[model samples]
Target: QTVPSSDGTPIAFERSGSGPPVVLVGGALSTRAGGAPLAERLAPHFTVICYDRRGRGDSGDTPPYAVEREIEDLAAIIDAAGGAAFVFGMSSGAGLSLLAAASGLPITRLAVFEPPYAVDDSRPPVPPDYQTRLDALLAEGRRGDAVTYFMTEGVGVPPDLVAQMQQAPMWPGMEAVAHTLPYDHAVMGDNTIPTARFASISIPTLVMDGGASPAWIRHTAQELADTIPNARYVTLENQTHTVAPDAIAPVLVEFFT
Candidate 1:
């Protein structure tokens, strides 16, 4: 199904299972398809709606992108999901969720995984020129390099591992959505937690990080959880940034229910 965003961009989404509504927002370099596994597992418990962020998948982009536009796209999706729904956001999507909730959308309950902020210099904060650099690469039509650059510089993935990933078959998939990397960077906004901004998020929120994820991420989740007035932080054992569906579905059920 599709809904018209505030800017009238078509926001495409698919729903599954039944019960209370739950919207899944994918992370950086992720299209709605990446959300399918979690959506399917959560299906039996909730009406899971997975939508492509504008500019990726079946969604259409209205240019001159702003973080506000993405939030409006989400709001448009929620409106189609019967006005209000529970939300689970992954990575940069997690930051978008927080911003949406803070902005007073009808997100009844919010859950986020590895929001990827650099809470206390665990690593350097995202560079001031990060988005510009990514855009420069994309403007040069070097899609793969943009993806690799996002992985290493923007997301702090080790350069050596990223070089290997460039040769991996899945690299093409990442390249396809390379243009939206800037959107994710825009959502994250300098990779710092907005303490006062999040402080206004009165909804019951669960901030999560995989035990196997980096210290920086775990630290970020901890600070995020502490920031929201009513928030809980969880660390799932043996889970990584690429979290296993089986590991998280149960936790989402418990929290949203």
Candidate 2:
């Protein structure tokens, strides 16, 4: 179904199952379809709502994007879920959820998996003008190049691995949403941990990292948990950014239930 956001952008979502509502917010390059597996797993226990973030999949995008607009998009979904819900965000979506909680959204409980902040210099910092460069690439219609740049520069994916991925079926999907890379970059805000901004998040939050994830991601999860007033940190064993739905569903069930 589609709901009009505060700006009237038609946000597309799918709802399934019964019980309390739980919203799944995907990260960069993800759509409602990509979240289906997780949603299916959570459906038996909660009303799972998976939506395409604006500009991806079936959702519509408006020009002159702002982070608050994305927050409002989530607000629309929350409202559609009957004014409150449990939220779980992955990667940059996790960072967006943090901002939403800080903004006083009615998220009863928030679970975030690796928010992708470059805290503690575990890896080279994202370039100061990363978002500007991404926007420039998009402005020049270098969609494929923009996607490659994000994979290599913004996401720290190994170049060789990215090259292999570019030849795969998912490459087209990634490029399709390449234009929104700047939005996720903005959600992360300079790639440094924004402790002060997150400190005010008063909701019961669970910040999680995969045991197999890179050091920087784990540090990011830990830092967010430490910064948020009502947050708990956990490490999911044998999991990485590409976490299995079965592995993650139980943890989310335990936390959000």
Candidate 3:
């Protein structure tokens, strides 16, 4: 099903199960359907609402796409789920969830997994002109190239991993949403929050890292957990950024229950 966003864009979504509502937010280059497997797993315990962030999957994206609109889109989903909901966000979506929590939304609880914030100058910088470059590539009908640029330029996904993922089933969907990569970056703001910024967030928060994930991501999670009031940091064994439910679901159930 779909609901009209605050800006009149149709935001497509899927709802399942029957319990307190839970919204799952996908990261950069992901769609509602891309996260369906995880949603299905969670549905048995909670009313899972999986939706496309405007511009991907069956959703509509009008001109003048801004990060604030995406936040409103999320707020709309929360309203649809009876005025409040728990949220689990990965990567860029995790960043968005933090913004929502900071903005004093009705999120009851939140789980953030490896948000990949570059705390130092050692990591590659997100191109300041990413939006322009993405637009130029999209105008040329170079979706694949645009996706590659987003992975390598925006997310710092190594060239080798990018090539390997090109053959994966989700690459096409990722490419389709390549044009909106800048929006994710914008939502993330500077990626470094003052330790005091999280002091005001009173909701329960779980910051997750994977054993196999990059050390930098672990550091990022640690910093976030230390700063957020009532937040805790945990690690999943033998898992990485693309973790499956078997490794994460139990952790979530334990924390959230």
Candidate 4:
């Protein structure tokens, strides 16, 4: 189904299962279908609402994209789910979800896996002018360059690995949405706020990181826990960023139920 966003973009969503509503937001370049595997695991216990963020999958994209606009896109989905729901987001999706929850979107509980906030500077910083450079690259139609920049500059993926990723199946989608990386950077804004801007959100939050994940990601989870008023941090031992249902599903069941 399509939810008409405030910005007039048609937000495509896939809904399934039955029970309390749980909204799943995908990471960068991911589709609602991309999260289907995870959603399938959670469906038995909670109604799952998954959607592609604007500019990817079945969703519509309007140019001059802003991070606040993406926040509203998520808001539209939550609002469509009767104005309240539990939310789980990964990576860049988590950043937007955090902004939404902070802004009082009626999220009952929030679970985030490895939002890449510049918490400790343990990893390389996002390019000082990532947005500016990305915009310039997009204007020049340098989508591949934009992707390389994001992998190397934004996420700290090794240069060689970034090259390897360019040939991967997901690389095409990454290139397709390369223009939207600035929106992600905008959501992460100075990255100095370990504490979120949404001070009134008293909802319990789970800030999780896989124990086997990179150190920078773990630091990010710790910082998020420290900042959110009632959030708790958990490390899933022997798991990494590409966590499976056996690793993440039970965690959600325990928290959201």
Candidate with best lDDT: 1
Candidate 1 displacement at residue 61 in angstroms:
0.7
Off by over 4 Å in 4: 194-199, 238-241
Lowest lDDT 10-mer window, candidate 1? 235-244
lDDT (C-alpha) at residue 128 in model 4: 75
Give per-residue CA lDDT, model 1, range 4-42, as digits (tens): 999999999999999999999888988889999889999
Model 3 lDDT vs. the true structure? Answer: 0.83
lDDT of 2 by residue, 53-147 (tens): 99999999987799999999999999988899999998889989888988899999999988888877776656667777888999999989998
Cα lDDT tens digits for candidate 4, 1-257: 99978889999998888999999988766778777888899999999999989987788988777887888899899988878999999888888888888777889999998887766757887777877887898899999998888778878888887887788887887788776777777777766553637445589999888866678888877777877789899887544435677788899899999
- Cα shift from native, residue 163, model 2 (Å): 2.3
Which of the two, 2 or 3, has more lDDT? 2
Q: List the residue pairs that clash in candidate 2.
A: none
Give the lDDT ranking, best first. 1, 2, 3, 4
Weakest ten-residue segment in model 3 by summed lDDT:
189-198
- Candidate with top TM-score is 1
Error of 4 at 211 (Å): 2.8
Cα lDDT listed for each candidate: 0.89, 0.87, 0.83, 0.82
TM-score, model 3 to reference: 0.93
Error of 4 at 216 (Å): 2.3
RMSD of 3: 1.8
* TM-score list, all predictions: 0.96, 0.94, 0.93, 0.92
Q: Which regions of candidate 2 deviate over 4 angstroms?
A: 239-241
